[PDB]
Write an enzyme that holds these catalytic residues in place. Structure first.
Site, PDB file in Angstrom:
ATOM      1  N   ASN A 122      63.037 -33.460  28.186  1.00  0.00           N
ATOM      2  CA  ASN A 122      62.217 -32.634  27.313  1.00  0.00           C
ATOM      3  C   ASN A 122      60.897 -33.326  27.003  1.00  0.00           C
ATOM      4  OD1 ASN A 122      65.336 -32.162  25.876  1.00  0.00           O
ATOM      5  ND2 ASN A 122      64.218 -30.484  26.861  1.00  0.00           N
ATOM      6  N   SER A 174      63.415 -36.677  24.556  1.00  0.00           N
ATOM      7  CA  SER A 174      64.857 -36.518  24.582  1.00  0.00           C
ATOM      8  C   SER A 174      65.286 -35.945  25.929  1.00  0.00           C
ATOM      9  CB  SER A 174      65.321 -35.598  23.454  1.00  0.00           C
ATOM     10  OG  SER A 174      64.903 -34.264  23.673  1.00  0.00           O
ATOM     11  N   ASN A 205      71.740 -32.342  23.704  1.00  0.00           N
ATOM     12  CA  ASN A 205      70.483 -33.072  23.584  1.00  0.00           C
ATOM     13  C   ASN A 205      70.639 -34.394  22.832  1.00  0.00           C
ATOM     14  OD1 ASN A 205      67.739 -33.426  21.792  1.00  0.00           O
ATOM     15  ND2 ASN A 205      67.314 -32.652  23.854  1.00  0.00           N
ATOM     16  N   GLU A 252      72.709 -22.932  31.227  1.00  0.00           N
ATOM     17  CA  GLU A 252      72.287 -24.285  30.880  1.00  0.00           C
ATOM     18  C   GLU A 252      72.347 -25.214  32.088  1.00  0.00           C
ATOM     19  OE1 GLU A 252      71.231 -23.848  26.756  1.00  0.00           O
ATOM     20  OE2 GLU A 252      70.768 -25.248  28.380  1.00  0.00           O
ATOM     21  N   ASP A 274      59.532 -34.009  24.277  1.00  0.00           N
ATOM     22  CA  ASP A 274      59.602 -34.975  23.186  1.00  0.00           C
ATOM     23  C   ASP A 274      60.256 -36.294  23.587  1.00  0.00           C
ATOM     24  OD1 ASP A 274      62.301 -34.346  23.313  1.00  0.00           O
ATOM     25  OD2 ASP A 274      62.475 -33.665  21.244  1.00  0.00           O
TER      26      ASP A 274
END
Ligand SMILES: [Cl-]
Ligand SMILES: [Cl-]
Ligand SMILES: [Cl-]
Ligand SMILES: [K+]
Ligand code: NA
EC number: 3.2.1.17
Length: 129
Positions: free
Chosen positions: A46, A50, A59, A35, A48
């Site tokens: 991201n 976020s 997130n 990660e 979207d």
């Protein structure tokens, strides 16, 4: 802060992640490796809108507040910036909520794609724990 592998394992164990929800310490270290490469200051935007924060790339759509993810929740009741600290307490406490949310560690796509089913014990091999 960029943790060493065994240094992070020890910090995760101190904060109660070892065997939390049945997931051995190596699973958590492997997830953090892929990660964030062990960097508490890692961020990822991201599509979207976020953002993922910290050593476990938590997130903002559901788990923390960053003020810039419309319609989102803050289920860990923290500013997302708290997930970037050198002290991993906030990330661990929030990860405990995430892994309890129903899908276990599949909540971390990188864990599913790169750690699940592998020899995760290698990630703590050699560490004084
Ligand atoms: Cl392990
Ligand atoms: Cl805000
Ligand atoms: Cl992946
Ligand atoms: K927001
Ligand atoms: Na949020």
């Amino acid at each position: 802060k960029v943790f060493g592998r065994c240094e992070l394992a020890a910090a995760m164990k101190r904060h109660g992640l070892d065997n939390y929800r049945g997931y051995s310490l190596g699973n958590w270290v492997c997830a953090a490796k892929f990660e964030s490469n062990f960097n508490t200051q890692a961020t990822n935007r991201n599509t979207d809108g976020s953002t993922d924060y910290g050593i476990l790339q938590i997130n903002s759509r559901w788990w923390c507040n960053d003020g810039r993810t419309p319609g989102s929740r803050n289920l860990c009741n923290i500013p997302c910036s708290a997930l970037l600290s050198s002290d991993i307490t906030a990330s661990v406490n929030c990860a405990k909520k995430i892994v309890s949310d129903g899908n276990g560690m599949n909540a971390w796509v990188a864990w599913r794609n790169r750690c699940k089913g592998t020899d995760v014990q290698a990630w703590i091999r050699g560490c004084r724990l």
